[PDB]
Structure 1
Amino acid sequence: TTPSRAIAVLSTETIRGNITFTQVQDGKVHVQGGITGLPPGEYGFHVHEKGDLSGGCLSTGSHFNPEHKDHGHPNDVNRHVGDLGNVVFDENHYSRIDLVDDQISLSGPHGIIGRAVVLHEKADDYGKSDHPDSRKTGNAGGRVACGVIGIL
């Protein structure tokens, strides 16, 4: 029995959130969640390759990228498996997540169980700016919280 459901918990002095992943549709994952703790705006949100928190958010590695593609927008053909775009915090510093993705999976080569979700300091530019980092990280800046993706 491969899992049908997964969860990542973010927990910092300033940030608390749960992000759940449920395997739905035609090989699709439904990502739902809520986070508090950041001012209104958009913040890079990705599945990074490693669920190693021994060096904090930094040891989670880079964006999960088994297909060896470039950084892009989740609607692009050319993107990392772990590119889920940005999350949005509303004026009460709350973010609801409710999205559907068809690259990430709960099993197989695109499996994310054991990996990390990382919430970033600023907005992901989806691989579409002149900025030097754009094509690898989306210039989303530093890592503010991460949590290992565990079986739910």
Structure 2
Amino acid sequence: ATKVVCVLKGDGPVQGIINFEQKESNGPVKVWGSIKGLTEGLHGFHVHEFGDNTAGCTSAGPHFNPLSRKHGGPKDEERHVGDLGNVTADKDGVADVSIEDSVISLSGDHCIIGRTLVVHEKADDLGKGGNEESTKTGNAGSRLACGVIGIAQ
């Protein structure tokens, strides 16, 4: 019943369309779509706090973290609301995104609408990388593409 969309673009060749759908307010959000122009392997995939693209992906700020928790993977209890883990690109540089998440929402306090979806340079280590940066950003590095998360038909 609620649908939102995000068009990912950046400075490089990284570009994608990501769809979100939530059938009930207390329910999981299905996240699906395609990103191309990635290097083979894992790329960190986060909702960032600000829907602000004024100076590219950098104005999106840190991980969307309304509950003031530490960084984790999508399937940890200890995670930022915006922690969607990694998408995986093949030798062709295509990541086929198919995620179900119960922590993000398309309504209420956990609502991601008007925030930024970012795909990262490197792998999110999901907070288990063994430095301080792991429990903040997960060491996923630079922002390759982003977009503001918007209300869909």
SS of the residue 1:81 aligns to = coil
1:80-99 aligned at under 5 Å gives the runs 80-99=80-99
The count of aligned residue pairs is: 150
Report SS of the residue matched to 1:137.
coil
Q: How far does residue 68 in structure 1 lie from its aligned partner after superposition?
A: 0.6
Q: 4+ runs of 1 displaced by more than 4 Å?
A: none
1:17 equivalenced with 2:11 (yes/no)? no
Q: Which runs of 5+ in 2 are unaligned?
A: none
Identity across matched positions, percent: 53
Which residue does 1:7 correspond to in 2?
A: 5
Of the structure 1 ranges 3-12 and 57-66, higher mean CA displacement relative to structure 2 is found in 3-12
Aligned mates of 2:106, 2:129 — CA distance in 1: 31
Task: Give the CA deviation at 1:129.
Answer: 1.6
For normalisation by structure 2, the TM-score amounts to 0.94
Deviation for aligned residue 1:24: 3.2
TM-score (norm. length: structure 1): 0.95
What's the offset of the Cα at 1:132? Answer: 3.1
- Aligned alpha-carbon RMSD (Å): 1.2
Q: Secondary structure at the match of 2:87?
A: strand
Contact kept, 8 Å, 1:7 with 1:151, in 2: the verdict is: yes
